[PDB]
Design a protein around this ligand. Structure first.
Ligand SMILES: [Co+2]
Ligand SMILES: [Co+2]
Ligand SMILES: [Co+2]
Ligand SMILES: [Co+2]
Ligand SMILES: [Co+2]
Ligand SMILES: [Co+2]
Lengths: 213, 213, 213
């Protein structure tokens, strides 16, 4: 068991969780711009690719905060020890997207090897879920490289007890001397508030500004 | 009775109200940036705090327009003579937010005294609604001070006949020579359209640019 | 018959369509900024008005891509040969909006004549749908000229099998040496993905940068 059953009996956010879960079911999206000036430099002195490093960096930050790793399993509220990213891959020949995942690793070079192999194996597989069933301990990551956006938001009919963060990136752009990346974060309010989203974004920004390895 | 029953029989927006209320239930959110350069200067020559003045200023503008003060009471469509703001307060020890309100006043200094006392009284109260039942004649105001956003949007499951405006502020930032504040406005389309939201924002901007007292 | 019944039996996006249509009903909105510097120049050397040219230009691009012209008719998935725009008109005396449409034409001057006459005929008609029943082969276009927005999003209760794109424009603004127009695109995920929205926006931008006639 790769999760811990959360002591909700005793949880300080108990009232908050039930209000936003059942009283006023709510989630929100917010788009913010990440300075990736430093990151671009780091990439430049390396052989790492952009999409693969963002995946890694987002999964790395989601994995430092518990509230971004919450779920319901057995009608119980759990916390995943770790999450693996499910990212999108564009298929040029069909104009559709496939969703892929691979195991997260604190070792970036091991991450990269995991990524390239999943990519090699399923590159021509235009099914929606080429690997089958999505692992429950996941996060969704996606990228719209062709257009810059100031906003993005998913309008989903029903969102009951779906607590995995959905992260979307747009095309970066030169905003003077800075290179910025619009990143949309969408979460459920039962487990995550505005503070927790801000704390993830401040952490991701830190990481973009640090050495890769 | 602190409201007037609206003559809907005769209302020019009658068809519009029923279409967006029952035919195609709809609301929208929009985020715009308020120049608060002047405001910062005003604050600087004063002892007023930021969050408290924004609250006051938003409640002041919501209180000049009727359509932002609408509601259903008794299955009747009403207009509130006045509304009191319900703002959020962050509790650092629990990572949760409390919602508080206090009486609106055209006298800012009286507003401030109302604010500080409600704050003093409930500062350590991490309940969600420390004061109990929210007053019906309200508006929601909230602030995400830790992160700058270009967009924000609430995804609420059901929104039936909930006509109170929800306003969210982000961290301001220096956009050249200007200090700007992302402000998200979310409303129901039955009572408020794009014109009315724009008219509120143009009015709030005016007010940010004027003397406080 | 102004549509073709789509071979969905054989469609490469078959799985994608049913997943986002029934499994996880989903749509999204995204706001991007269109450089209309060139366009302003073109207008300047002409007698064309802004709202009318944007309408024309958006309808022109929607009409080059099939996926933006999809619908359900007879429980069948169709593609419209062509679509006519339904745009909004502000009535200053009532503070409400009317929705109007007129026939699309590859000849801009013919477009303009169609537009001016529909405008002349229904200018003082504050009904919501002054012309009656909206043509099925449409797109919605709207404009909020009074305020600049970085984001916009419609929160619609139910969106079942409604595949027509909704496009919203804000007030442009001078962003240094460029004049930019925030444009919000909202679509259903069953027929349109992030690639297809980006491809529409890249096409509209091209068109803004080209001669009118
Ligand atoms: Co419950
Ligand atoms: Co860990
Ligand atoms: Co009705
Ligand atoms: Co009054
Ligand atoms: Co089905
Ligand atoms: Co054609």
């Amino acid at each position: 068991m790769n999760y811990t059953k959360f002591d909700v009996k005793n949880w300080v956010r108990r009232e908050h969780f039930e209000f936003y879960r059942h009283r006023l079911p709510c989630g929100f999206s917010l788009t913010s711009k990440i300075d990736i000036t430093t990151l671009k430099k780091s990439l430049d002195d390396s052989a790492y690719k952009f999409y693969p490093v963002m995946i890694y960096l987002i999964a790395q930050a989601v994995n430092q905060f518990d509230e971004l790793r919450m779920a319901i399993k057995d009608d119980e509220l759990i916390v995943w020890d770790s999450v693996d990213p499910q990212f999108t891959v564009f298929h040029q020949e069909t104009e559709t997207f496939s969703a892929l995942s691979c195991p997260y690793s604190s070792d970036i070079d091991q991450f990269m090897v995991n990524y390239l192999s999943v990519m090699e194996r399923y590159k021509s597989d235009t099914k929606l879920f080429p690997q089958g069933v999505t692992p429950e301990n996941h996060l969704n990551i996606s990228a719209l490289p062709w257009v810059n956006f100031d906003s993005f938001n998913l309008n989903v009919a029903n969102f009951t007890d779906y607590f995995a963060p959905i992260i979307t990136m747009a095309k970066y752009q030169q905003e003077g001397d800075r290179l910025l990346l619009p990143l949309s974060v969408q979460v459920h309010h039962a487990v995550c508030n505005g503070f927790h989203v801000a704390r993830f974004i401040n952490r991701l920004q830190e990481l973009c500004n640090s050495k890769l390895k």
